[PDB]
Structure 1
Amino acid sequence: TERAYQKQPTIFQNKKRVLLGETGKEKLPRYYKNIGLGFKTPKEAIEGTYIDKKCPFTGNVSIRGRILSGVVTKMKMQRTIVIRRDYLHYIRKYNRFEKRHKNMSVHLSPCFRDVQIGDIVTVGECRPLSKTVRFNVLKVTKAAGTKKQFQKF
């Protein structure tokens, strides 16, 4: 849905569908892009309703360069979340390691539904989408725990 001033990606909407005059399906004009790299396009990009300027599977955002991994911290920001990459920095003097981390804010495509805090996620380098975001959510790996559990109500 569009609840803003306009959203319409590239594909020409009006194929003069009154050739007999009929209701019909109208989800047919959807742009569909493979990123390649052996990473499967999810089917939410196939049968979605959303129009996103910055989605890697709908927009013109190419994917190149580096492929990193992190874990989801927060989701408060609109269509973009904040991941955290831990690692081990070496010191030559003491000859053992220490932990460090640098929080990366990454653009989250809305096709990746149910993306609960704590999962290992994979990101790819892009062009600068915004001021602090330079990566894009490539593939969500885990649900971080058990999907199967259910509680009362």
Structure 2
Amino acid sequence: MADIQTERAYQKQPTIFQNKKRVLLGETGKEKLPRYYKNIGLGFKTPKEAIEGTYIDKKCPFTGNVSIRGRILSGVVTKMKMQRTIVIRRDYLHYIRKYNRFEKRHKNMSVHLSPCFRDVQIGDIVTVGECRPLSKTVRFNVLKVTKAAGTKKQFQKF
């Protein structure tokens, strides 16, 4: 919040510039930084916390340098010990045709999760879309979070 330059190099959004002319503000002041953000398409909506926020993240869909294309998928949040990335589980049934019967299977995906989502928990349901390769094992990025079709965080009044 109050400081974000925790790295050895200065952190800023590309395409935003601050004028060093007409700088007078009197006894008070206003934000020296305007905010860059965009529409993703496909009927998704941009979070309020991306527009009203102050974080820097180049891999963010709403406020960074990525294009959402190809497949849209969903899965269950299962681990989150990395920084700005999480692991999600996908479960399915496989048909074996000699018998007339099914077999249970799973796979894991590592995905990139930006700030603007900040109340996610293990067992939440998440929707993701493809990007260019973002790191060695990461190809997908979080577009929406939900806990519909399931029990509450704490008691039923949540």
TM-score normalised by the shorter chain: which range applies? 0.7 to 0.9
In structure 2, stretches of 5+ residues that fail to align are 1-5
Shift in CA distance, 85/17, structure 1 to aligned 2, threshold 3 Å: farther
Structure 2: how far apart are the matches of 1:80 and 1:146? Answer: 25
Shift in CA distance, 87/47, structure 1 to aligned 2, threshold 3 Å: same
Secondary structure of 2:70's aligned partner:
coil
In structure 1, stretches of 5+ residues that fail to align are none
Is contact 1:115-1:143 (8 Å) kept?
Answer: no
Moved more, 27-36 or 77-86: 27-36
Shift in CA distance, 17/109, structure 1 to aligned 2, threshold 3 Å: farther
Shift in CA distance, 22/53, structure 1 to aligned 2, threshold 3 Å: farther
Secondary structure of 1:66's aligned partner:
strand
Q: TM-score, normalised by structure 2?
A: 0.83
Report the equivalent of 1:40. Answer: 45
Is contact 2:85-2:110 (8 Å) kept?
Answer: yes
Deviation for aligned residue 1:109: 1.0
Moved more, 69-78 or 2-11: 2-11
Structure 2: how far apart are the matches of 1:98 and 1:74? Answer: 25
Deviation for aligned residue 1:149: 3.6
Secondary structure of 2:13's aligned partner:
coil
Deviation for aligned residue 1:12: 1.4
Shift in CA distance, 16/143, structure 1 to aligned 2, threshold 3 Å: farther
Deviation for aligned residue 1:28: 4.7
Report the equivalent of 1:75. Answer: 80
Structure 2: how far apart are the matches of 1:42 and 1:120? Answer: 17
Aligned length: 153
Structure 2: how far apart are the matches of 1:96 and 1:14? Answer: 68
Question: What is the root-mean-square deviation of aligned Cα atoms in Å?
Answer: 3.1
Shift in CA distance, 112/152, structure 1 to aligned 2, threshold 3 Å: closer
Q: TM-score, normalised by structure 1?
A: 0.85
Q: 1:28-48: CA deviations, max 9, x gaps?
A: 510011101111111001101
What is the percentage of aligned positions where both structures have the same residue? 100
Is contact 2:69-2:131 (8 Å) kept?
Answer: yes
Structure 2: how far apart are the matches of 1:23 and 1:66? Answer: 49
